[PDB]
């Protein structure tokens, strides 16, 4: 079984690492989206001030 | 109860056998 299944297991290990990388990138990118959206409002107020 | 996914084995076997096969 170890040799019969080892290829399928190695594929799953690779997919888990890839999926963790992608989902943490989504997390950080969604944080960046929400700050720049809020920062974009703050800059719009700054335009009227300057 | 554990290997109840064998329903998915026969279904994918069935779907595979719909290739080069008839309507409905």
């Amino acid at each position: 079984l170890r040799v019969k299944l080892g290829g399928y297991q190695a594929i799953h290990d690779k997919l888990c690492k890839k999926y963790q990388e992608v989902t943490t990138e989504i997390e950080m990118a969604n944080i960046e989206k929400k700050t720049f959206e809020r920062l974009g409002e703050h800059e719009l107020k700054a335009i009227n001030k300057r | 109860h554990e290997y109840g996914n064998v329903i998915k084995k026969v279904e994918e076997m069935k779907v595979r056998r719909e290739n080069e096969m008839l309507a409905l």
Partner: protein, 469 residues
């Protein structure tokens, strides 16, 4: 079908959805969450167990066995190793949450510290452009010397708190033991600031007069006259004779209990004056005002010795100033939650103890300067690490009522807190002791007597009231 629980992130054999969120949960988890918090875990909408819609579609298929999962003891071994990683994950989260709150405080601090720099330069740029837009063709050093012992020396004598100081069980009997009337003229009555020296006291009136008064005898000692507007701050000198007072007429006038006339006048401000404080040597007056300036002068000769704009180019409310008897490391409170300790040789900040969004009405150091307390009308009072520039302890309350004044006791083991109402804390235990409601209006100024055994107050109720036990 296949589903994953929003709470656990695992597959679920019993998928359910709240009516108040799009997110789906394992039923026993969300029910246990509701049983504690009564709310949607993600939207925070109020939620009840009957607002749950159940997916009768078949739950997620079983995860295939590992080859090591083919034996019961190796499942238990696998369960043990799985469980340890789950607990280390849960333990890692609470560490990460602590670190994130450290860094958030520091960035906001570093953000708020940068806003101090923007504010100074922006007004200094504005004053520079305004010129273009309208262009037409030494005791301080001895204070450092004294600071070069007393900020570190005073453990040598302050070895213990006094034995005669009130215990926590004794001050619980505080009551209004005297009430005072007729201190100020009935045509424009009111007392806006208060100070004491033992049983002697000094009062600033809405009637544009300063009255030296004895709150033990219920007797006027002396009336000082010469201000053109109502009083805003006063200081009573330890010599029992000299008095200093500040008014909305933008001037500071110094008086003597022997005299009907000014011992000295300081004409040094652009707008209403707000606070004054006394050098521990007694000869020199320190002052702040609503014009964003501070000024410092010799009382004994009348000569002004230094003055600076805190930040020129705007009329901004400085509303407290203090002197600290080591010699230095004291500060000013101002409008935009400024609490700036001053590097007096260099006319720049030295340290800070803000704790507020709103302006700060009072600042008090302890005898040895390892306690300080501050408060504001945004509703909290806090105790401060004078030694290391950090927070130590907080007083908090349900209503966030205006707090108008603060005072340590004689020793710094009690702290009176109030405004619309009055309370006193025993600081050495940090517990609330008593609540006082005998005033029929806001309090304007606070002092404590010897051994914390008495409390002296003025109020918008048009009386001066004394509390003791």
């Amino acid at each position: 079908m296949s589903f994953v629980c929003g709470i656990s992130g695992e597959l679920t054999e019993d998928p359910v959805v709240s009516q108040v969120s799009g997110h789906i949960f394992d039923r026993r988890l969300i029910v246990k969450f509701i049983a504690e918090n009564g709310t949607d875990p993600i939207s925070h909408g109020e939620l009840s167990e009957d607002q749950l819609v159940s997916l009768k579609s078949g739950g997620t298929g079983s995860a295939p066995r590992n080859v090591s999962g083919t034996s019961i003891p190796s499942l238990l071994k696998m369960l043990q190793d799985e469980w340890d990683t789950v607990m280390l994950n849960s333990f890692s989260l609470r560490q990460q949450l602590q670190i994130a709150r450290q860094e958030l405080s520091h960035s906001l601090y570093q953000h708020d510290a940068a806003c101090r720099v923007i504010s100074r330069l922006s007004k200094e740029l504005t004053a520079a452009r305004e010129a273009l837009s309208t262009l037409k063709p030494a005791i301080l050093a001895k204070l450092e010397e004294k600071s070069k012992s007393l900020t570190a020396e005073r453990k040598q004598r302050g070895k213990n708190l006094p034995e005669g100081l009130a215990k926590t069980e004794e001050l619980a009997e505080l009551k209004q033991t005297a009430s005072h009337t007729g201190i100020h003229s009935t045509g424009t009555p009111g007392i806006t600031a208060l100070d004491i020296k033992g049983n002697l006291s000094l009062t600033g009136g809405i009637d544009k007069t300063v009255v030296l008064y004895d709150y033990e005898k219920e007797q006027v000692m002396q009336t000082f006259k010469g201000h053109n507007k109502k009083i805003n701050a006063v200081v009573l000198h330890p010599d029992n004779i000299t008095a200093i007072s500040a008014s909305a007429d933008s001037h500071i006038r110094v008086w003597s209990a022997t005299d009907s006339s000014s011992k000295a006048i300081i004409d040094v401000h652009q707008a209403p004056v707000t606070d004054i404080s006394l050098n521990a040597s007694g000869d020199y007056i320190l002052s702040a005002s609503d014009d964003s300036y501070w000024a410092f002068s010799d009382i004994r000769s009348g000569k002004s010795l230094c003055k600076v704009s805190v930040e020129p180019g705007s009329q901004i409310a400085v509303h407290s100033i203090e002197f600290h008897p080591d010699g230095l490391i004291f500060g000013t409170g101002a409008a935009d939650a400024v609490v700036k300790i001053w590097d007096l040789k260099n006319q720049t900040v030295a340290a800070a103890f803000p704790g507020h969004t709103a302006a700060v009405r009072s600042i008090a150091f302890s005898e040895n300067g390892y306690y300080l307390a501050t408060g504001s009308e945004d509703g909290e009072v806090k105790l401060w690490d004078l030694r290391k520039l950090k927070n130590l302890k907080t007083f908090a309350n349900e209503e966030k009522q205006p707090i108008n004044s603060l005072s340590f006791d004689m020793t710094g083991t009690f702290l009176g807190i109030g405004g619309q109402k009055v309370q006193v804390l025993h600081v050495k235990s940090w517990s609330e002791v008593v609540s006082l409601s005998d005033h029929s209006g806001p309090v304007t100024g606070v002092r404590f007597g010897e051994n914390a055994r008495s409390l002296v107050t003025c109020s918008l109720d048009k009386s001066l009231r004394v509390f003791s036990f």
